[PDB]
């Protein structure tokens, strides 16, 4: 029920800055990062596939806005139409030197932060009649989502070599409630109401719009994977998408945390996100969705 039920207290021999000396150290590893070998014997999960380059502690994962600017002889045309779905003529066009600041927020199932719609929730699919195509919903009013890892983590440094340090979770104290995200129940209900209203235009007024939760697959695809405060969350979002629509309170999403990240859906290049000292707190805007329809 606690955060401590998600952790394994793993002890191992580590190299010292002197090649001929060893170092009996320990660290708290999440159960999602250790795989048993058959005080039992375990090993890090991405160890038969690659070696994990440690997420370098002095570089931040916070996305800064980047503008993509066209070279000489080219121009960037910007569609200023407010009802422009994603395709076809755009009556109002502009030539911008280059785009607005696009924050590269990396997330799944929910478009955290970013740009809102102008007048109404926009539904954008390559072929709305094809269930194999994702539907990019864009909100007009953001839905605020609050993260947390209540634990007061204690980062610990291990010298694994000359000049190289390994940052490990030495101890965990404080509030041991599981990491979670809160979405306002009233705000989310009226946002799905707007999504449903704009979604019946493509399927019928008398059709029944039902939101179910993710089908299956990797934890990166079945969960609202995202980064917040340098530590990577994987939230359930099964209480967000659970409703059937016929023609102060809050929603708490239990989130797991991992330290070994295979981010860009690749195999062979993992990354070890080092522990973040202290309590992590999070304020984001849900500005969109990525939906898939059932055949």
């Amino acid at each position, epitope marked *: 029920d606690d955060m401590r039920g998600e952790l394994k207290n793993c002890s191992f021999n580590m190299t010292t800055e002197l090649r001929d000396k060893k170092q009996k150290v320990y660290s708290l590893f999440y159960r999602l990062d250790v795989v048993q070998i058959n005080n039992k014997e375990y090993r890090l999960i991405n160890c038969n596939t690659s070696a994990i380059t440690q997420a370098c502690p002095k570089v931040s994962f916070e996305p800064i806005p980047i503008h993509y600017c066209a070279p000489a002889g080219f121009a960037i045309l910007k569609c200023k139409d407010k009802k422009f779905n994603g395709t076809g003529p755009c009556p109002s066009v502009s030539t911008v030197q280059c785009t607005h600041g696009i924050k590269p927020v990396v997330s799944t199932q929910l478009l955290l932060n970013g740009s809102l719609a102008e007048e109404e929730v926009m539904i954008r699919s390559e072929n709305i009649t094809n269930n194999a195509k994702n539907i990019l919903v864009q909100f007009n009013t953001p839905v605020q989502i609050n993260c947390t890892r209540p634990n007061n983590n204690t980062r610990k440094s291990i010298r694994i070599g000359p000049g190289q340090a390994f940052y490990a979770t030495g101890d965990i*104290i*404080g*509030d*041991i409630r599981q990491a979670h995200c809160n979405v306002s129940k009233a705000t989310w209900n009226e946002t799905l109401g707007k999504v449903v209203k704009q979604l019946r235009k493509h399927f019928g007024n008398n059709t029944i719009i039902r939101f179910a939760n993710s089908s299956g697959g990797d934890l990166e695809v079945t969960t609202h994977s995202f980064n917040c405060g340098g530590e990577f969350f994987y939230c359930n979002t099964s209480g967000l998408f659970n409703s059937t629509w016929i023609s102060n309170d809050s929603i708490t999403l239990p989130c797991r945390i991992k330290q070994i990240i295979n981010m860009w859906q690749r195999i062979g290049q993992a990354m070890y996100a080092p522990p973040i000292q202290g309590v992590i707190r999070c304020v984001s805007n849900i500005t969109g969705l990525i939906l898939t329809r059932d055949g």
Partner: antibody
Amino acid sequence: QARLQQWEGRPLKPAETLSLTCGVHGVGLGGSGWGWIRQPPGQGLQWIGEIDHDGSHKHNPALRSRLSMSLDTSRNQVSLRLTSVTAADTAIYYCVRVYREKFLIGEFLTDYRFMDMWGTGTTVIVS
Amino acid sequence: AIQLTQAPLTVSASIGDTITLTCRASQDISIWLSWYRQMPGKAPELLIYAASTLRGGVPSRFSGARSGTDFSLKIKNLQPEDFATYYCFQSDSYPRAFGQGTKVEIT
């Protein structure tokens, strides 16, 4: 067999440096914290200061800027360097190990420090 | 800082009695209050930590209670080794403080 041994430093002249040393046997300086407790004659005990597990130096407000402690990890010794000793500092000085046990209140986990292991006593008299 | 008030400063009882010692704090220090016994001429020793937990080796006669302000220690089946000076020590705020000391003697 775990004991803290400290030896008498003999009487010292007023307005000097008070150098104490505690010998840690059975256990080592790591992991716990080490502090100093005194006891003026016919009176109760008084807290001087401690070094906690983190290596951080808690000092009593009454003794301002005249306090300094150190840990000899190689020799397993705890040192006290009280300066400008006045006649009111005539007391038996004890070396203690503030041990950390975690006690779980309803939802909160704390490191509780409770001076597990006491020295034998160093009667310091200034005249 | 936090001031611990320990009363009565001198309680007298014969061998085979039951005594209750009081240590009142200034603020609320939760349950972090340990008890130390100083035999005359010896060094103080830990009896009770966290106001309820008995130290390894202390007989079951010793017992504490309360987690607010009026902390209490109860001794049962008094023996000559219990006639010493008891101190209550708080561990909530970093300006640590001791009690005044309750000298328990024979009548």
